[PDB]
Amino acid sequence: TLKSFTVEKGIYQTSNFRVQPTESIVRFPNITNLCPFHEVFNATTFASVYAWNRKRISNCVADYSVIYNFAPFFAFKCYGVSPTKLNDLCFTNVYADSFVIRGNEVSQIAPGQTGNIADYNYKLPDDFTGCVIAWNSNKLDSKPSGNYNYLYRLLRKSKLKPFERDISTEIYQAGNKPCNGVAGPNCYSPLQSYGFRPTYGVGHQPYRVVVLSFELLHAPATVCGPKKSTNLVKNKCVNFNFNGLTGTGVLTESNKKFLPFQQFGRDIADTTDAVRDPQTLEILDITPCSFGGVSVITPGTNTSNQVAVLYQGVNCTEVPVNVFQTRAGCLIGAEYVNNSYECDIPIGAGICASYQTQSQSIIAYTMSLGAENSVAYSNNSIAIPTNFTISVTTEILPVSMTKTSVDCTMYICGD
């Protein structure tokens, strides 16, 4: 730590000690259903852009590796979660959407996106989590006469909120004259077909899009991944996994009164304090395992190679990561004597250590403030000196320090 081969007399802080967890605890709610992802991805015709369906998925185990075997897609583009680690955590709500769009509006499905589909047909929220399965559909959504089974709307009077629909057809008017249901002057029907043809370019081919949405653990969980549970043990430094959150601490019993809609407990630093078991209705506290600082007390390397170790601020019945308990932790390697000398090496609240002969050893003691004196006071007694001494005393004071200069262009960049 000192980057040297000879250390001097003193107390040095070297590192920190942390009690390591032993076991692993995995807790999940008990569900046996499988989420039917196979029945959604294949259909003769999907729903329209303006009439996209919604599937409520809950209370089932979802294995997401089977989605790669159901469609030959290029981009599995996701934002808030990586696609390879959905089997570990758990959620509370899974959505599903289905619509068929053009090939030039595939990138319009994005958080914080504007355009035609993203502004008037299908808008995603800015805080969107979960992602989208999109693949080409030129094989099944193409006809020589053209596909006219899907409709899209050109524009409306304002903007459209995320997760909003528009089914009804009304004749648009851009003037004071009334349309009266007839597409006359400044009156146009806003619905027209895509007209999918194989004679177009590569950017206008039909595409099949399936969108999934997730909801984070702000509630009791329903949907989970395939993961075996583990028996619950307490009063031991373990690695718990309560419904997809990892941590390390000592789980104990609690006296906190929880409301029936409550399952968590947070701290000021947004750290979990208590947790609800998904199996039984019992509240367990979370307290992190014991730690502290390690200070090494030594004389010089020219004197001895012995050391004494101070573990700061611990009751050291739990010390395995001469034992004497101080107020600043406890001291290992030095014995406590019932004497009092000057303070050589300061340890803590009134305790000092040194290197004395009573065979050389490192001892710990309570420091002495000074010699006890009791000057004789009386109301008719005085003491007057009869001689003197002349004393010369040295006092050292710093005055100036080193003057330095810097060049930013040669320090940061170097020509």
Ligand X SMILES: *[C@@H]1O[C@H](CO)[C@@H](O)[C@H](O)[C@H]1NC(C)=O
Scanning residues 13 to 32, which ones bind ligand X (CB under 6 A)?
A: 30
Interface with ligand X, residue 315, by CB under 6 A: yes
Which residues precede gaps in the chain, with C-N > 2.5 A? 321, 358
Contacting residue, 12, 17, 64, 70, with ligand X by CB under 6 A? 70
In whole angstroms, the minimum distance from the beta carbon of 138 to another protein comes to 29
Structure-token match 């000879």, residue found: 6
User: CA–CA distance from 217 to each of 90, 253, 263, 273 (Å)?
Assistant: 8, 23, 10, 16
Instruction: With H, G, I as helix, E, B as strand and everything else as coil, classify residue 64.
Output: helix
Which is nearest to 91 in space by CA: 40, 57, 133? 57
Distance (Å, rounded) from C-alpha 273 to C-alpha 266? Answer: 5
Q: Of these partners, another protein, ligand X, none, which one is at the site of residue 395 (CB under 5 to 8 Å by kind)?
A: another protein
Select from 39-47, 80-88, 191-199, 353-361 the region that touches another protein (CB under 8 A).
Answer: 80-88
Asked if 141 and 100 touch (Cβ cutoff 8 Å), the reply is yes
Applying CB under 6 A, the site for ligand X has a residue count of 12
Q: What residues contact 189, with CB distance under 8 A and at least 6 apart?
A: 169, 171, 172, 183
Residues 225-264 binding another protein (CB under 8 A) are 244-248, 250, 252, 254-256
Residues 3-42 binding another protein (CB under 8 A) are 13, 16, 18
In whole angstroms, the minimum distance from the beta carbon of 40 to another protein comes to 24
Site string for another protein, 302-341 (x = CB under 8 A): ----------xxxx-----------xxx------------
Select from 34-42, 100-108, 153-161, 261-269 the region that touches ligand X (CB under 6 A).
Answer: 34-42
Distance (Å, rounded) from C-alpha 264 to C-alpha 218? Answer: 9
Interface with ligand X, residue 374, by CB under 6 A: no
Question: In 222-232, which positions are buried (b, 16+ CB within 10 angstroms) versus exposed (e)?
Answer: bbbbeeeeeeb
Distance (Å, rounded) from C-alpha 345 to C-alpha 352? Answer: 5
Amino acid occupying residue 63: D
Q: Of these partners, another protein, ligand X, none, which one is at the site of residue 373 (CB under 5 to 8 Å by kind)?
A: another protein
Site string for ligand X, 278-297 (x = CB under 6 A): -x------------------
Interface with ligand X, residue 235, by CB under 6 A: no
C-beta closer to ligand X: residue 71 or 110: 71
In whole angstroms, the minimum distance from the beta carbon of 383 to ligand X comes to 5
Residues 122-181 binding another protein (CB under 8 A) are 126
Contacting residue, 39, 372, 395, 407, with ligand X by CB under 6 A? 39
Interface with ligand X, residue 349, by CB under 6 A: no
C-beta closer to another protein: residue 76 or 200: 76
Residues 267-286 binding another protein (CB under 8 A) are 267-271, 273, 285
Residues 369-388 binding another protein (CB under 8 A) are 369-388
Which is nearest to 223 in space by CA: 125, 39, 87? 87
Applying CB under 8 A, the site for another protein has a residue count of 91
Select from 24-32, 78-86, 191-199, 301-309 the region that touches another protein (CB under 8 A).
Answer: 78-86
Q: What residues contact 125, with CB distance under 8 A and at least 6 apart?
A: 111, 162, 163
Q: Which long-range contacts (C-beta less than 8 Å, at least 24 apart) are formed by 115-121?
A: 116/152, 116/154, 117/49, 117/152, 119/159, 119/160, 120/153, 120/154, 120/155, 120/156, 120/160, 120/166, 121/49, 121/50, 121/152, 121/153, 121/160, 121/166
In whole angstroms, the minimum distance from the beta carbon of 171 to ligand X comes to 39
Q: Of these partners, ligand X, another protein, none, which one is at the site of residue 411 (CB under 5 to 8 Å by kind)?
A: another protein
Distance (Å, rounded) from C-alpha 241 to C-alpha 245? Answer: 5
In whole angstroms, the minimum distance from the beta carbon of 263 to ligand X comes to 16
Q: Of these partners, another protein, ligand X, none, which one is at the site of residue 279 (CB under 5 to 8 Å by kind)?
A: ligand X
Interface with ligand X, residue 317, by CB under 6 A: yes
DSSP 214-271: EE-SSS----B-S--------SSEEEEEETTEE--EEEEE--PPPPTT--EEE-TTS-
The contact set with ligand X (CB under 6 A) reads 30, 38-39, 42, 70, 279, 315, 317, 325, 376, 379, 383
